[PDB]
Design a protein around this ligand. Structure first.
Ligand SMILES: *C[C@H](F)C(=O)N1CCN(c2nc(OC[C@@H]3CCCN3C)nc3c2CCN(c2cccc4cccc(Cl)c24)C3)C[C@@H]1CC#N
Ligand SMILES: Nc1nc2c(ncn2[C@@H]2O[C@H](COP(=O)(O)OP(=O)(O)O)[C@@H](O)[C@H]2O)c(=O)[nH]1
Ligand SMILES: [Mg+2]
Length: 169
């Protein structure tokens, strides 16, 4: 049975954990320890294809040990998450993009740009600017709310499709 290793990255507080739990369990967790990094597994049906998602919810600390690279390098695809009400989280996307390129040693890594917290009326990041960034990278852009589940299937299933597309090549 097919296993896809997904990795969720992005600034503290963007909603990595809430997005992951929303995908795996179908509810919103508004308080999950910000330091806690863990893998979540779920059997899914995408485009009629049965598979196992193994999703790393990144946290811990910013460090570049051999061991941290090895672990991130096992990811087949990455969700680059920012929050639509946090400009800095949006600017930080380039950092994560660059680290993924470095550890996979490739310009062609399956990635999806995720603008989370789409339910909030305190937007600081233009959807236009977001789309232009995803376009500059050659990757899909999905607006999400972990709170309302808006876009959550779309974000994870899109990334699986990007991985399948990479695995065919
Ligand atoms: C809030 C909670 F602690 C959290 O989610 N964290 C802490 C930060 N951490 C992290 N942070 C950065 O950068 C943070 C800012 C942005 C620009 C540079 N700094 C100032 N970068 C990373 C990580 C986790 C470890 N990451 C890493 C390390 C080696 C290889 C590699 C390969 C691909 C992708 C990554 Cl993220 C890699 C770099 C983690 C987490 C925030 C997240 N995600
Ligand atoms: N309104 C709203 N709040 C969210 C959403 N996703 C996460 N949050 C909140 O944002 C904060 C950080 O979420 P968390 O999942 O811990 O972020 P992480 O550090 O990237 O794991 C918490 O207070 C969450 O309740 C969302 O889609 N909408
Ligand atoms: Mg978290």
């Amino acid at each position: 049975m097919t296993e896809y290793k997904l990795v969720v990255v992005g600034a503290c507080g963007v909603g990595k954990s809430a997005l992951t739990i929303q995908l795996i369990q179908n509810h919103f967790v508004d308080e999950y320890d910000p330091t806690i990094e863990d893998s979540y597994r779920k059997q899914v049906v995408i485009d009629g294809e049965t598979s196992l998602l193994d999703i790393l919810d990144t946290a811990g600390q910013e460090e570049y040990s051999a061991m941290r690279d090895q672990y991130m390098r096992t990811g087949e695809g990455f969700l680059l998450v920012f929050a639509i009400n946090n400009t800095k989280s949006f600017e930080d996307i380039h950092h994560y993009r660059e680290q993924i390129k470095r550890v996979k040693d490739s310009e062609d890594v399956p990635m999806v740009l995720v603008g989370n917290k789409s339910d909030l009326p305190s937007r600081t990041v233009d959807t236009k600017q977001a789309q232009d960034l995803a376009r500059s990278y050659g990757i899909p852009f999905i607006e999400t709310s972990a709170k309302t589940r808006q876009g959550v299937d779309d974000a994870f299933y899109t990334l699986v499709r990007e991985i399948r597309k990479h695995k065919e090549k």
